[PDB]
Amino acid sequence: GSVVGGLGGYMLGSAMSRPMIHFGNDWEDRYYRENMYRYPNQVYYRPADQYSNQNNFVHDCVNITIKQHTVTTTTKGENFTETDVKMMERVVEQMCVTQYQKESQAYYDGRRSS
Numbered sequence: 001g002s003v004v005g006g007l008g009g010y011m012l013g014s015a016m017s018r019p020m021i022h023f024g025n026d027w028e029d030r031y032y033r034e035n036m037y038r039y040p041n042q043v044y045y046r047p048a049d050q051y052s053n054q055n056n057f058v059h060d061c062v063n064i065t066i067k068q069h070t071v072t073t074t075t076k077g078e079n080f081t082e083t084d085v086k087m088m089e090r091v092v093e094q095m096c097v098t099q100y101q102k103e104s105q106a107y108y109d110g111r112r113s114s
Contacts, residue, residue, distance in 0.1 A: 010045055010046050010064055012042060013042060015041045015042055016043070016095045016099070019090070021091065023086075023087075028086075032091075038078075039069075039087065043061055043064075043065040043095045044061070045061045048100065054097065057096065057100045061100070062089055062092055069088070
């Protein structure tokens, strides 16, 4: 994990696979697809040590990955409008839903792959 310091004790995991959300729409599907690269392929999250349920973590990891991008524009330009944010609310979602599970299989066992 490339655990960024500019976080309130959250981490940074690994690169993922930018999903294929269609939003149940034709235009959202397309607009996302045409721009899917602009969004991160990663997420930020606190450790599952203080969690239990998908909602709690996913809700945080939404707000966090979104804002950390929508705030990183204060040193970049990634300002992400409401339409971009709604894409992110699903993109960082699927990433975080996975990201949870990845660590849930490394917090439950004591991390002993030996």
